[PDB]
Amino acid sequence: DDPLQQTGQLFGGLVRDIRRRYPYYLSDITDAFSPQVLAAVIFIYFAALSPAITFGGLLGEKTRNQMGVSELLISTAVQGILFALLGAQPLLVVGFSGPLLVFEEAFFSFCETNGLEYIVGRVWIGFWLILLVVLVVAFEGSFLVRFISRYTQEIFSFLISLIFIYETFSKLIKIFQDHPLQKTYNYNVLMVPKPQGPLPNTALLSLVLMAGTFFFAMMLRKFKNSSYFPGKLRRVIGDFGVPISILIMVLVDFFIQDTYTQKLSVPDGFKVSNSSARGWVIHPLGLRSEFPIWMMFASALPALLVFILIFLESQITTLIVSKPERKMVKGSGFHLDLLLVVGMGGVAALFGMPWLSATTVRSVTHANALTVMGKAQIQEVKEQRISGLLVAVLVGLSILMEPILSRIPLAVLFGIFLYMGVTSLSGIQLFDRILLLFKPPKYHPDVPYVKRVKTWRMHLFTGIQIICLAVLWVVKSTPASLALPFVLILTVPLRRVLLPLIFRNVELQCLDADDA
Amino acid sequence: DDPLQQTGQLFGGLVRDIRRRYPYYLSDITDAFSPQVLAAVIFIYFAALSPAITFGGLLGEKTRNQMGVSELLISTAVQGILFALLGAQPLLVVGFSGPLLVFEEAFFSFCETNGLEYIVGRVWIGFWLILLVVLVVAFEGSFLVRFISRYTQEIFSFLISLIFIYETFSKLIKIFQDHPLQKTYNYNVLMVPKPQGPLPNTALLSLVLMAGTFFFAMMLRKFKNSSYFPGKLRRVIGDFGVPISILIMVLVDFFIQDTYTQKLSVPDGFKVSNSSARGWVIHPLGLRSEFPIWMMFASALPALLVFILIFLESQITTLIVSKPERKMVKGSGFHLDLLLVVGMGGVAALFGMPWLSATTVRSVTHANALTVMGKAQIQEVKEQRISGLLVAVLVGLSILMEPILSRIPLAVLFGIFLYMGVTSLSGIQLFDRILLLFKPPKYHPDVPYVKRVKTWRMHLFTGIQIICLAVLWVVKSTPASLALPFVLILTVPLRRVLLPLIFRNVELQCLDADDA
Ligand SMILES: CCCCCCCCCCCCCCCCCC(=O)OC[C@H](COP(=O)([O-])OCC[N+](C)(C)C)OC(=O)CCCCCCCCCCCCCCCCC
Ligand SMILES: CCCCCCCCCCCCCCCCCC(=O)OC[C@H](COP(=O)([O-])OCC[N+](C)(C)C)OC(=O)CCCCCCCCCCCCCCCCC
Ligand SMILES: *[C@@H]1O[C@H](CO)[C@@H](O[C@@H]2O[C@H](CO)[C@@H](O)[C@H](O)[C@H]2NC(C)=O)[C@H](O)[C@H]1NC(C)=O
Ligand SMILES: *[C@@H]1O[C@H](CO)[C@@H](O[C@@H]2O[C@H](CO)[C@@H](O)[C@H](O)[C@H]2NC(C)=O)[C@H](O)[C@H]1NC(C)=O
Ligand SMILES: CC(C)CCC[C@@H](C)[C@H]1CC[C@H]2[C@@H]3CC=C4C[C@@H](O)CC[C@]4(C)[C@H]3CC[C@]12C
Ligand SMILES: CC(C)CCC[C@@H](C)[C@H]1CC[C@H]2[C@@H]3CC=C4C[C@@H](O)CC[C@]4(C)[C@H]3CC[C@]12C
Ligand SMILES: CC(C)CCC[C@@H](C)[C@H]1CC[C@H]2[C@@H]3CC=C4C[C@@H](O)CC[C@]4(C)[C@H]3CC[C@]12C
Ligand SMILES: CC(C)CCC[C@@H](C)[C@H]1CC[C@H]2[C@@H]3CC=C4C[C@@H](O)CC[C@]4(C)[C@H]3CC[C@]12C
Ligand SMILES: CC(C)CCC[C@@H](C)[C@H]1CC[C@H]2[C@@H]3CC=C4C[C@@H](O)CC[C@]4(C)[C@H]3CC[C@]12C
Ligand SMILES: CC(C)CCC[C@@H](C)[C@H]1CC[C@H]2[C@@H]3CC=C4C[C@@H](O)CC[C@]4(C)[C@H]3CC[C@]12C
Numbered sequence A, B: 001d002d003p004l005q006q007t008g009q010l011f012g013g014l015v016r017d018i019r020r021r022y023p024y025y026l027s028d029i030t031d032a033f034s035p036q037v038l039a040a041v042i043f044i045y046f047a048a049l050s051p052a053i054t055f056g057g058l059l060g061e062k063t064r065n066q067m068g069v070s071e072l073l074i075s076t077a078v079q080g081i082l083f084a085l086l087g088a089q090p091l092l093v094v095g096f097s098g099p100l101l102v103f104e105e106a107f108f109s110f111c112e113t114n115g116l117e118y119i120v121g122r123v124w125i126g127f128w129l130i131l132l133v134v135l136v137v138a139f140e141g142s143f144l145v146r147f148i149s150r151y152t153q154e155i156f157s158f159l160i161s162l163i164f165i166y167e168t169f170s171k172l173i174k175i176f177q178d179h180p181l182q183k184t185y186n187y188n189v190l191m192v193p194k195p196q197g198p199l200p201n202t203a204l205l206s207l208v209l210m211a212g213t214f215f216f217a218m219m220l221r222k223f224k225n226s227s228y229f230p231g232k233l234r235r236v237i238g239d240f241g242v243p244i245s246i247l248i249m250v251l252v253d254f255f256i257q258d259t260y261t262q263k264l265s266v267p268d269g270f271k272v273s274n275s276s277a278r279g280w281v282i283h284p285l286g287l288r289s290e291f292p293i294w295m296m297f298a299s300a301l302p303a304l305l306v307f308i309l310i311f312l313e314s315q316i317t318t319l320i321v322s323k324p325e326r327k328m329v330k331g332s333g334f335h336l337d338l339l340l341v342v343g344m345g346g347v348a349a350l351f352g353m354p355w356l357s358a359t360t361v362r363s364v365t366h367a368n369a370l371t372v373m374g375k376a377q378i379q380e381v382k383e384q385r386i387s388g389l390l391v392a393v394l395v396g397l398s399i400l401m402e403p404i405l406s407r408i409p410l411a412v413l414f415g416i417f418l419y420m421g422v423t424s425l426s427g428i429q430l431f432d433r434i435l436l437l438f439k440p441p442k443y444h445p446d447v448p449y450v451k452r453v454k455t456w457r458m459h460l461f462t463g464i465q466i467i468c469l470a471v472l473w474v475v476k477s478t479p480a481s482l483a484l485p486f487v488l489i490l491t492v493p494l495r496r497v498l499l500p501l502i503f504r505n506v507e508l509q510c511l512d513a514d515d516a
């Protein structure tokens, strides 16, 4: 009963993925009825919205507002609803990511250089993405995901978690750079788009609001595991640990009258970001000028890059989420989820909306938000479709409920991202082994890679993984960032051909195991 | 070998106190040679100086600068040196306290009403205090301290710890009240005594500097108990946990250029605070006017109140510090330490310097700073005279080393007081039982008052102690604050006559035990 197995018939894996999960569909609605699932919806909502506002803004700056916040909120909503209802692993959160923004900036810059319509060029990439995924799913190409071991999974999962933390701290630093601690400030600064000059108390209050939210969140996680108050009340207050932390620090900010803090800013209504540039439906043949015939064929090469990015990101996320370690019983599908994520992305491009991917930190946070703890060991995970569906609906309705969001500071949400980033580093053995570099070999745990293998060998293995982690980081900030998936693919040969001639067969097994 | 035993000969207890401890004098110098003792000196120095600047300032405001910061630094230094060299329990820290400030304000107000010289009136109280202590020590009156049980000790020790925490938070609130978070501030505010108006970033930076110092201090206490880095390095970094926390946040404040923070402010040189009012030596018969003869006899009644305040404060501190629970082997003296503290206080009054007392939180912090931890259980305490002697010398030289202190913010020291206040609530069983009110009865810790006594009876006992704690608090803020020692004395009858008719003899033993 292994999902990653070649049947030997066209669309064999996809049929097996549907036949496996869809018999649980009744359970995937009823199992939602518990207060922990409501606590997950509220937490994952802010986690899911915040990127759609951030990246949506950056897309508006870069692509001359031809694709903006409105487009990304509509895409994240509709794909989120459809995936929650049809998907084989509903705990996956579908949304925009850094590598996709890098491509849109790149493909726009290319279209402006050659004098092409950016938004029409996306429609053709969209058509190729539908053709490629249907071909890959037909011949069962998701069997190749079997070769992606824990080695590549953990390097990837750790890299995203560290960058997510770095990105959160970069936002705090930007406030201090915008609103420095000066002796004298200029009064009557215009604030109609944003504060024109620096302001007093803005940077230090933002620090307090971030630090406050993180503290409260980490304290309420400890309280859940403690032995204070009746057991029933302890779990409920623990389950709602994040949404209590957010409510407190939003009220703290509210009662402070004079000091300025930056709040959430959603679009006016459900409109295209630049009506002069485009509409809702885009004509493949062209809007203003006749779209060239060569690019209608040459759009396969950008479509191949976009496919590889969405595949590697989404399939590695599905492995990390659906590990044997985490108590997942209902099952996962690599063929059905891949067809939906890339298929919807191709159709989305026809309406000028961005294609998305199953993002790691949001997916992991959602799974960690729904998991139960016993005694420390995991008993069960609340595997349903409702938690995913509701977050997608709220992201859709975020424009209508602007009055509520306008009272929420961004500083408060930075504290929640720090909590997400730190909490994501749980099941990653690479993180566990990085902490053993500092511990004496006296107090190291009693795990196989600690008992069976020598300490200096274990550390060398951890060392080679940190070098891989450093090289991937450099590739991601250096302008050659679109060629990360290919550099991440080279982690698979390293593990299978180069490590075996350094380390012994028994050691590689113990250190990198499938089931642990 | 019980210190609190009547011999039946004049100055019997005092001779037994000297004969017991002075044979260890060689050990009380050599046992100082360890890096933990240096870490204690630096921590207890700031803890000892800060009150002498704070109360010294308040004394200057209240007594028309007839007794100020210079007088209190000189007194704390000279009495600190003499007590460290001669005292039977050198871990006691001698300095000014809240109840002594309440008396000086009261006795000044009385002298101004009746038209008497405040500073001369103190000289007579000083002479009575020498007469009373010599009489009490002769007839061995410190045997009465035997009747002060754990019941009264813990109520007292908890009350001082809570007030110390409340006082620390009151100082932070005062900065926000002085420097509110406004939209617009006035520039070119005069800062020659202090900021004349409010300032931007002053209150929020003070909050960050306090919160930062407390965080770092509590993190470095956890690191000491952890299993990270080599054991040798872990203890050294752990022992210097406070002085590392102070150095970090002082450097953080230093590199911030434009923002204002209030720093430590010591006197110019070793001078009397008001030279026009008084000199170094005070003539008992009078300075300007002939001192009245009735007040030379009536000064016995204020001297009796001052004696009771210094006795109750100092002797309860000596019990809490020299408990059987804490590994104290060299021994304590209630007769010798009482003679020194009150005797020096009487002589100090002749030079116009304040009489002091063995303060609880400073004494407890000093003992906790010098105690070793094994595996969690106490192995030993570094009982010496050097740690006490050095802090007294540094408080004396604090005026000369003004350049160093001028760089230290008060906000940083507020974080250190919060750490002291929280950490002081360790051995107090009342605090332990207050936490069990929130825990369910199955998660209780295994101890006699949990196994032998029923849960509802244990909670009633904790309840009656909280009522005693509430009444004492009200008495201390309400203008009748000088009559706290008498209300604290009434805790002894309560425990011995009223509790036995409510609770059973077995229960009172288990809940309130001498050795546990
Ligand atoms: C074991 C881990 C320890 C780590 C602890 C480190 C602290 C972590 C938290 C970071 C700081 C977050 C503080 C946010 C509070 C809101 C402050 C604010 O902006 O209010 C402005 C408000 C604004 O007041 P206002 O605007 O309402 O005033 C009325 C209106 N006017 C001004 C017009 C008259 O000012 C204050 O009065 C705030 C006072 C500070 C109160 C906060 C206490 C901080 C606690 C210190 C740390 C200790 C933690 C607990 C210790 C016990 C644990 C064992
Ligand atoms: C488990 C318990 C969790 C509790 C954690 C809660 C936080 C507790 C600490 C309280 C806040 C203390 C922060 C002090 C930083 C000093 C900032 C400052 O004033 O610098 C001004 C400086 C400016 O100084 P400057 O030198 O650049 O200014 C001069 C230059 N010109 C002239 C151009 C202006 O501002 C900054 O740029 C620094 C901002 C970053 C500060 C750090 C952010 C802290 C957020 C939380 C950290 C998380 C800790 C660990 C998490 C993991 C735990 C598992
Ligand atoms: C709306 O779309 C038009 C069409 O692209 C944008 O017009 C561009 O203006 C920029 C300068 O701001 C020029 O560099 C481009 O050549 C223009 N594009 C074309 C092809 O006309 C306009 O910038 C967009 N406005 C918004 C809302 O961003
Ligand atoms: C120095 O000492 C003199 C003597 O007490 C103080 O003079 C007092 O001045 C206050 C008003 O400030 C009057 O209420 C008192 O009547 C004065 N005292 C007497 C008896 O003359 C003076 O205030 C002190 N200055 C300082 C440094 O505080
Ligand atoms: C205003 C924004 C920033 C925060 C919104 C968070 C809100 C929706 C959260 C914060 C605390 C939450 C409550 C916490 C605890 C409980 C008890 C549970 O048995 C039913 C739900 C209920 C009553 C929650 C409802 C939702 C709630 C009110
Ligand atoms: C979402 C978009 C991209 C999908 C477009 C391709 C369509 C035509 C594909 C996707 C899923 C496919 C079906 C999945 C399952 C089966 C059952 C099998 O016994 C015969 C083939 C059949 C009927 C497949 C062929 C046609 C099908 C509907
Ligand atoms: C309410 C739940 C079920 C769905 C949540 C998403 C909803 C609120 C979103 C998703 C996409 C959105 C639509 C996207 C585009 C348009 C075209 C425009 O000319 C009118 C508004 C309209 C028709 C939007 C209305 C709101 C909408 C339907
Ligand atoms: C992260 C950047 C700075 C690169 C630094 C190299 C790091 C990641 C790795 C590469 C090889 C590693 C070393 C390999 C082998 C040993 C032997 C033994 O004593 C345990 C630690 C030690 C000494 C390792 C420490 C960490 C190490 C130095
Ligand atoms: C005003 C002066 C006396 C106060 C100074 C402290 C007093 C209490 C001290 C200083 C020296 C002390 C005495 C020195 C020597 C002895 C002899 C000894 O066999 C019994 C104790 C006795 C009698 C001491 C106790 C009382 C004493 C007089
Ligand atoms: C500037 C003010 C506010 C803070 C002063 C604190 C200073 C004196 C403290 C902070 C850290 C301390 C050091 C921490 C660790 C060690 C290692 C030990 O084996 C010898 C002492 C030594 C080298 C300490 C010396 C004193 C020290 C430098």
Ligand SMILES: CC(C)CCC[C@@H](C)[C@H]1CC[C@H]2[C@@H]3CC=C4C[C@@H](O)CC[C@]4(C)[C@H]3CC[C@]12C
Pocket (backbone or CB within 6 Å): B074, B077, B078, B270, B271, B393, B396, B397
């Ligand atoms: C090194 C040890 C022994 C002593 C440490 C503290 C020293 C430096 C302190 C304690 C008390 C202080 C003295 C207190 C009072 C006066 C009177 C004044 O008109 C001149 C300074 C003088 C004389 C001070 C000099 C410094 C002093 C002696």
Ligand SMILES: CC(C)CCC[C@@H](C)[C@H]1CC[C@H]2[C@@H]3CC=C4C[C@@H](O)CC[C@]4(C)[C@H]3CC[C@]12C
Pocket (backbone or CB within 6 Å): B437, B455, B456, B459, B460, B462, B463, B464, B466, B467
């Ligand atoms: C501000 C006031 C309330 C402080 C006075 C102390 C309070 C908290 C004390 C006084 C008497 C105490 C109660 C005495 C007896 C019991 C029965 C036990 O089975 C549960 C706890 C309970 C119900 C106690 C709870 C705490 C209590 C109410």
